[PDB]
Scaffold this active site. Structure first.
Site, PDB file in Angstrom:
ATOM      1  N   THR A 164      -0.240   3.356  -8.933  1.00 46.31           N
ATOM      2  CA  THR A 164      -0.743   4.663  -9.345  1.00 46.31           C
ATOM      3  C   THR A 164       0.252   5.387 -10.244  1.00 46.31           C
ATOM      4  O   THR A 164      -0.143   6.054 -11.206  1.00 46.31           O
ATOM      5  CB  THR A 164      -1.071   5.510  -8.117  1.00 46.31           C
ATOM      6  OG1 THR A 164      -2.043   4.831  -7.315  1.00 46.31           O
ATOM      7  CG2 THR A 164      -1.628   6.860  -8.532  1.00 46.31           C
ATOM      8  N   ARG A 212      -8.390   0.951  -5.667  1.00 48.80           N
ATOM      9  CA  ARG A 212      -7.301   0.012  -5.434  1.00 48.80           C
ATOM     10  C   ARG A 212      -7.698  -1.365  -5.944  1.00 48.80           C
ATOM     11  O   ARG A 212      -8.788  -1.856  -5.631  1.00 48.80           O
ATOM     12  CB  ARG A 212      -6.941  -0.064  -3.950  1.00 48.80           C
ATOM     13  CG  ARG A 212      -5.823  -1.046  -3.649  1.00 48.80           C
ATOM     14  CD  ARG A 212      -5.439  -1.033  -2.183  1.00 48.80           C
ATOM     15  NE  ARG A 212      -4.267  -1.861  -1.930  1.00 48.80           N
ATOM     16  CZ  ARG A 212      -4.313  -3.148  -1.618  1.00 48.80           C
ATOM     17  NH1 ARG A 212      -5.463  -3.791  -1.505  1.00 48.80           N
ATOM     18  NH2 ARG A 212      -3.177  -3.807  -1.414  1.00 48.80           N
ATOM     19  N   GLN A 230       2.100 -11.056  -3.977  1.00 46.12           N
ATOM     20  CA  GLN A 230       1.955 -11.049  -2.495  1.00 46.12           C
ATOM     21  C   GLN A 230       3.348 -10.942  -1.869  1.00 46.12           C
ATOM     22  O   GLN A 230       4.327 -11.269  -2.564  1.00 46.12           O
ATOM     23  CB  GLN A 230       1.231 -12.303  -2.008  1.00 46.12           C
ATOM     24  N   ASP A 275       6.079  -3.482 -13.100  1.00 37.93           N
ATOM     25  CA  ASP A 275       6.084  -3.723 -11.629  1.00 37.93           C
ATOM     26  C   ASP A 275       5.871  -5.200 -11.300  1.00 37.93           C
ATOM     27  O   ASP A 275       4.784  -5.695 -11.617  1.00 37.93           O
ATOM     28  CB  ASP A 275       4.943  -2.978 -10.947  1.00 37.93           C
ATOM     29  CG  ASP A 275       4.937  -3.095  -9.434  1.00 37.93           C
ATOM     30  OD1 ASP A 275       5.843  -3.751  -8.894  1.00 37.93           O
ATOM     31  OD2 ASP A 275       4.027  -2.525  -8.812  1.00 37.93           O
ATOM     32  N   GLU A 323       0.831  -1.204   0.000  1.00 37.19           N
ATOM     33  CA  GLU A 323       0.000   0.000   0.000  1.00 37.19           C
ATOM     34  C   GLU A 323       0.870   1.261   0.000  1.00 37.19           C
ATOM     35  O   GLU A 323       0.880   2.050   0.946  1.00 37.19           O
ATOM     36  CB  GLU A 323      -0.980  -0.010   1.179  1.00 37.19           C
ATOM     37  CG  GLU A 323      -2.059   1.060   1.102  1.00 37.19           C
ATOM     38  CD  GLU A 323      -3.382   0.599   1.678  1.00 37.19           C
ATOM     39  OE1 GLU A 323      -4.420   1.211   1.351  1.00 37.19           O
ATOM     40  OE2 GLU A 323      -3.384  -0.374   2.461  1.00 37.19           O
TER      41      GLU A 323
END
Ligand SMILES: Nc1nc2c(ncn2[C@@H]2O[C@H](COP(=O)(O)OP(=O)(O)OP(=O)(O)O)[C@@H](O)[C@H]2O)c(=O)[nH]1
Ligand SMILES: CN[C@@H]1CCc2c(ccc(O)c2O)[C@H]1O
Lengths: 310, 337, 265, 54
Positions: A44, A118, A144, A140, A39
């Site tokens: 973004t 999100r 997890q 990217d 997070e």
């Protein structure tokens, strides 16, 4: 068959011919790996490139985020009709949101719209674009959390590594409670990345994300940095400070986080390692030249270093 | 609750006691009268060029004439070892590839990597156009190896401590295996394709069953990660290459480690191991830019192959035992004989 | 003792030049920018193998070879001298392009472009030397060159024609007026980067200084006296001219040792 | 939860298996190697006339 050698020679020719064209394209591209904690804002930033540099389940996804945020606040209080029921809407529970886990996009949805939601994805997330007829390749790895990171040896030839941290998350725990606050968790990840065997010649671009939330947190008297970080009491504003247009209290808070990341970089950095700190807001800031201007420095410095000059 | 953990120690102690009784004599003493092999020296015969970046995957064919290589530039080239002539060059949908395979009948090639998806290609098709046949996409975490039991079954080993036996026709998992606490990094099928092993990252290896889908044994002699594994040609033993400098040889029937291979000067890791045709020489790659040749029955080094300018990441031996191919990270393959 | 021992000195210089240039050429024989270094090494080796042993016997003592052989030597001397100098300007231009414009460096230069540039520069160097010698148009009209032109065993050099000036203009004057600007720009660019470093948180001077100073000290006196002696009324002795020419020749012996500093080039 | 209960049941399966002494396994491996060492081109070099790669 004389013909059999002739045909094979002809087939090797077409394949070898293309690999000549593909070599030129491959050698004229730049690859930028994204790293960060959970997070933080890695997704973004990629979306910011797709909105200006290059070039529907979102409506359903947006509603799902609003639905999940509604139940989270009321649950902690104890500890067409469906949408209308939650519309009427407990405010004090939202104010003390640092004592539990809650999504940042809860307030805006309940009260840039498409890029505020999100979504969690496991597969690698990729993006290609051009800005000044120079190819760029941003991707990217995501996934997890993994504490082994055995795939990091693959990325041994990238141009630079983009690092994103959450600068307004110094009073929240991460995943399992009672753990270190999120800002400390980012520092431990930075040390492992910086002091890595394979990544011994890769520069790091540091993005101190979520600046707008930092300003309002310090402005309010809810939490003080001195409580969580005792060393902040004796901190003083550096002489070489050039704050944009800001209160002295907010400006001091911005740098203390920044210089705290720097002391890790300068300790073990003897050549072939540089860190470029920036103050960015992912959603609002509209210029992508920050990466472009920086990427022209790693190359030149590398050439300059090359030839022994520096 | 706590009683179950109390009984776990008792069973753990029971296994060690049983193995201590079966240690009649070490293998070193019994084979002390065998004459040494001597000095083994080989020279490069062919060099294959045409890759734009570092290479991780390589696999021979049944005819032992054609091989397929993979790299992270986005290409999957098929060579012709005899005359050094490329036959195909398949572009890939993703630029990150960590494994490749080759069907026993030569009609298919497999691939996979960080994209969490295993892809299957077709070679012998109408109009001579290679196209993706199926896309096996049920996993989480990266893949490490792919193997072909037949034209319809493929075994994968993803990075979420699981393995599965797929089915190309339906694209669904027939069975799944669990029990590892760490990432799975390699596997190797048996000569009869009835059992296979897997070297995880928790310093352990298991012996699964293809049909029943259950674990049978567990060997925990190492001290670090495991990067390679391969069966003895007999089918009752295998060798393991771990992150530390040591490589060990286990035995299925005796259920114990038999020999260990190490050298004082060597302090690097191992990325690929393989045997010879008769199971007398144990080749092994290394991170220190070369490949060493050990002895299965003597633990004596008997040659060094150091013609590479980068680390060795893959290795293989032909089905007739005539050549050894070693890839590397400088986009160059080599054939030794 | 003195004449023969100085001869020992010339022999030593020849062996050294040949060994160094040959070893560098063999190790290189690979980057897009190494072709120019290979060309410089090849020209250095050719000059060292062809000029110095021939000139040594003449310096010690009668020129035994024929008139055509002497003409070939005094023609190849200019070609060898002007081939090495012109490559340094190309190297400086390549470095300036690489540093000042990083992104366009890959697109601007390729193997074909390097081959075209090297062929053009070699043709330009060759056209200056052999053509006037074969044509014999540059021969002086003074009363001192008649003896050398008539005696097949006597060798000397004389050109009062404008050719000497052009030879210098296109051999030595053109490269430096470009190299000075190139290296000044490179130094200015390097100086900006350290300053930027200071806000986030000199070996360059030494290396640029040595790179300039070696060839400057080696070659400036020769191309100074070459222009000077023609205008003046014999203010320069021939022996001093030969000594300065040899001192200039010494540069090619150490130029490959300057570049290739990086280990295991 | 019941993870320990599942683990102990699995461990009991591997506790009761048939094992043989190390001597028999070593003898079997040595006999196999001695029997099949004849056709090992890597071990004993083949003449260049019968070498496909030479
Ligand atoms: N207020 C604010 N929120 C931001 C900003 N940048 C990112 N965010 C938050 O980011 C949310 C979108 O999801 P992200 O937090 O980016 O999720 P992500 O980056 O994919 O998470 P990772 O998988 O860890 O990379 C938005 O709803 C915001 O809450 C910023 O500049 N200001
Ligand atoms: C004495 N030998 C020659 C004669 C003139 C000359 C030389 C070098 C470069 C030139 O451009 C020249 O015109 C000398 O090396």
């Amino acid at each position: 068959q004389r013909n059999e050698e002739k045909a094979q020679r002809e087939a090797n020719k077409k394949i070898e011919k293309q690999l000549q064209k593909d070599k030129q394209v491959y050698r004229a591209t730049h690859r930028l790996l994204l790293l960060g904690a959970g997070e933080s804002g890695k997704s973004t930033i990629v979306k910011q490139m797709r909105i200006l540099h290059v070039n529907a389940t979102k409506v359903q996804d947006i509603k799902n985020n609003l639905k999940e945020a509604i139940e989270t606040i009321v649950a902690a209080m104890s500890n067409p009709e469906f949408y209308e029921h939650a519309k009427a809407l407990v405010r004090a529970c939202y104010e003390r949101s640092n004592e539990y886990q809650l999504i940042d996009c809860a307030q805006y949805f309940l009260d840039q719209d498409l890029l505020r939601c999100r979504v969690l994805t496991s597969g690698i997330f990729e993006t290609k674009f051009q800005v000044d007829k120079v190819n760029f390749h941003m991707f990217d790895v995501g996934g997890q959390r993994d504490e082994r990171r055995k795939w990091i040896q693959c990325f041994n030839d990238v141009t630079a590594i983009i690092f994103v941290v959450a600068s307004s998350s110094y009073n929240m725990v991460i995943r399992e409670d009672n753990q270190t606050n999120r800002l400390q968790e980012a520092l431990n990840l930075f040390k492992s990345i910086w002091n890595n065997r394979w990544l011994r010649t890769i520069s790091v671009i540091l993005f101190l994300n979520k600046q707008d939330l930092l300003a309002e947190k310090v402005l309010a008297g809810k939490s003080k940095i001195e409580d969580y970080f005792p060393e902040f009491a004796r901190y003083t504003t550096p002489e070489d400070a050039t704050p944009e247009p800001e209160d002295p209290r907010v400006t001091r808070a911005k740098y203390f986080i920044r210089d705290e990341f720097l002391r890790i970089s300068t300790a073990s950095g003897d050549g072939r390692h540089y860190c470029y700190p920036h103050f960015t807001c992912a959603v609002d800031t509209e210029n992508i030249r920050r990466v472009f201007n920086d990427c022209r420095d790693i190359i030149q410095r590398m050439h300059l270093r090359q030839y022994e000059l520096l | 609750l706590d009683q179950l953990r109390q009984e776990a120690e008792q069973l753990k102690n029971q296994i060690r006691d049983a193995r201590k009784a079966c240690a009649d004599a070490t293998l070193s003493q019994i084979t002390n009268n065998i004459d040494p092999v001597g000095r083994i020296q080989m020279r490069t015969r062919r060099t294959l060029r045409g890759h734009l970046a570092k290479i991780y995957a390589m696999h021979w064919g049944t005819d032992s004439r054609l091989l397929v290589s993979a790299s992270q530039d986005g290409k999957l080239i098929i060579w012709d070892s005899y005359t050094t002539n490329k036959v195909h060059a398949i572009p890939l949908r993703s630029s990150w590839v960590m494994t490749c395979a080759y069907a026993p009948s030569g009609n298919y090639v497999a691939c996979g990597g960080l994209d969490n998806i295993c892809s299957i290609y077709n070679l012998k098709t109408r109009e001579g156009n290679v196209r993706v046949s199926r896309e096996l996409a049920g996993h989480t975490g990266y893949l490490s190896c792919c193997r072909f039991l037949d034209d319809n079954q493929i075994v994968t080993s993803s990075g979420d401590t699981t393995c599965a036996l797929w089915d190309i026709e339906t694209g669904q998992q027939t069975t799944t295996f669990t029990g590892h606490t760490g990432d799975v990094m390699s596997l190797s099928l048996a000569p009869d394709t009835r059992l296979f092993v897997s070297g995880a990252c928790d310093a352990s290896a298991k012996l699964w069953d293809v049909r029943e889908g259950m674990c049978r044994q567990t060997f925990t002699g190492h001290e670090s990660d495991i990067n390679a594994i391969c069966f003895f040609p007999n089918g009752n033993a295998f060798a393991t290459g771990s992150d530390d400098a040591t490589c060990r040889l286990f035995d299925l029937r005796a259920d114990q480690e038999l020999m260990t291979y190490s050298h004082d000067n060597i302090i690097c890791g191992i990325t690929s191991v393989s045997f010879s045709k008769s199971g007398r020489l144990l080749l092994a790659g290394y991170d220190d830019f070369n490949c060493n040749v050990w002895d299965a029955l003597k633990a004596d080094r008997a040659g060094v192959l150091a013609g590479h300018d980068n680390r060795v990441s893959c290795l293989g031996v032909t089905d007739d035992g005539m050549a050894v191919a070693t890839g590397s990270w400088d986009s160059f393959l080599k054939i030794w004989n | 003792v003195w004449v023969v021992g100085m001869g020992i000195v010339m022999s030593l210089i020849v062996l050294a030049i040949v060994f160094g240039n040959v070893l560098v050429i063999t190790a290189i024989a690979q980057t897009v920018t190494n072709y120019f270094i290979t060309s410089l090494a090849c020209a250095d080796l050719v000059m060292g193998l062809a000029v110095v042993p021939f000139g040594a016997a003449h310096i010690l003592t009668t020129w035994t070879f024929g008139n055509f052989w002497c003409e070939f030597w005094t023609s190849i001397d200019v070609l060898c001298v002007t081939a090495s100098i012109e490559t340094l300007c190309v190297i400086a231009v390549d470095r300036y392009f690489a540093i000042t414009s990083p992104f366009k460096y890959q697109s601007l230069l390729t193997k074909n472009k390097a081959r075209v540039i090297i062929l053009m520069v070699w043709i330009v160097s060759g056209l200056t030397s052999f053509l006037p010698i074969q044509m014999h148009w540059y021969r002086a009209t003074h009363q001192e060159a008649i003896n050398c032109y008539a005696e097949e065993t006597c060798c000397d050099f004389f050109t009062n024609q404008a050719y000497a000036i052009a030879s210098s203009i296109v051999s030595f004057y053109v490269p430096l007026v470009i190299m000075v600007f190139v290296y000044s720009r490179v130094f200015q660019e390097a100086k900006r980067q350290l300053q930027k470093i200071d806000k986030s948180e000199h070996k360059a001077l030494k290396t640029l200084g040595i790179i300039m100073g070696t060839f400057t000290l080696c070659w400036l006196p020769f191309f100074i006296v070459n222009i000077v002696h023609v205008i003046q009324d014999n203010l320069i002795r021939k022996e001093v001219y030969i000594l300065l020419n040899w001192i200039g020749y010494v540069n090619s012996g150490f130029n490959p040792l300057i570049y290739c500093r990086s280990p295991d080039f | 939860i019941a993870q320990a209960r599942k683990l102990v049941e699995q461990l009991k399966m591997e506790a009761n298996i048939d094992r043989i002494k190390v001597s028999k396994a070593a003898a079997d491996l040595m006999a196999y190697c001695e029997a099949h060492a004849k056709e090992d081109p890597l071990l004993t070099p083949v003449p260049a006339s019968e070498n496909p790669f030479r």
